[PDB]
């Protein structure tokens, strides 16, 4: 295992995250290079359980998935990755940084996540938890996919029958598109989880968010088709979002919030 590294090489400066699973920090690796590090509390999560997501980050490599750098596979376990300067995509949209984002940047972000997911698609994996809080933003508004181990984001066939496919990811990607256009507000405003399952199942889909182009709401609606197989591919979505402003919405004018 060439991914393995020694311990004195990690300085853990700033503390970013925590919970049941363990902490995650900003650090340094061999004195110079800036990294992000994620830790394990041995009590709650088991040793072979926490490893799970790191075996998965070894077998994947793409400019839009957060990159593995090194691992310390002896307790307490450490996982080392590139440092995404600008935090979770959800915080970014909610906070004072995201009030000035308009459609052109928001669509470019969507296209980058779509790229990363089209790579997941090609490699026959399934994400399961694709949403704005597990997208990390970097310098120059680079967005990358982050979690490798919630009914408002999960497709119904998945939430009800455990059927998690790349098509169930496409559903979630559609909800992610509403997070990008409402500055990271919670999808299904006012509805609690049990009420969302009922409504969705009976055909309800979110309306076109204010100032969102109808062509982009149509796309969300393709991603939310009752039938998994009539939802588009990430290859299709990528290509669509990449060319948005020539091929679909060349008329685009900026507005007050998009
Ligand atoms: C904390 C975290 C990470 C991160 C993600 C994945 C891995 Cl394997 C290691 C660390 C971040 C990175 N890479 N860059 C910048 N910020 C990062 N954070 C976000 C800080 O959240 C406040 C990680 C995430 N996301 C986390 O908190 N996860 C546990 C399971 C709660």
UniProtKB/Swiss-Prot annotation:
<protein>
    <recommendedName>
        <fullName>Proto-oncogene tyrosine-protein kinase Src</fullName>
    </recommendedName>
</protein>
<feature type="domain" description="Protein kinase">
    <location>
        <begin position="10"/>
        <end position="245"/>
    </location>
</feature>
<feature type="binding site">
    <location>
        <position position="38"/>
    </location>
    <ligand>
        <name>ATP</name>
    </ligand>
</feature>
<comment type="similarity">
    <text>Belongs to the protein kinase superfamily. Tyr protein kinase family. SRC subfamily.</text>
</comment>
<comment type="subunit">
    <text>Forms a complex with polyoma virus middle T antigen. Interacts with AFAP-110. Interacts with GJA1 and PXN.</text>
</comment>
<feature type="binding site">
    <location>
        <begin position="16"/>
        <end position="24"/>
    </location>
    <ligand>
        <name>ATP</name>
    </ligand>
</feature>
<feature type="modified residue" description="S-nitrosocysteine">
    <location>
        <position position="223"/>
    </location>
</feature>
<feature type="modified residue" description="Phosphotyrosine; by CSK">
    <location>
        <position position="252"/>
    </location>
</feature>
<comment type="function">
    <text>Non-receptor protein tyrosine kinase which is activated following engagement of many different classes of cellular receptors including immune response receptors, integrins and other adhesion receptors, receptor protein tyrosine kinases, G protein-coupled receptors as well as cytokine receptors. Participates in signaling pathways that control a diverse spectrum of biological activities including gene transcription, immune response, cell adhesion, cell cycle progression, apoptosis, migration, and transformation.</text>
</comment>
<feature type="modified residue" description="Phosphotyrosine; by autocatalysis">
    <location>
        <position position="161"/>
    </location>
</feature>
<feature type="active site" description="Proton acceptor">
    <location>
        <position position="129"/>
    </location>
</feature>
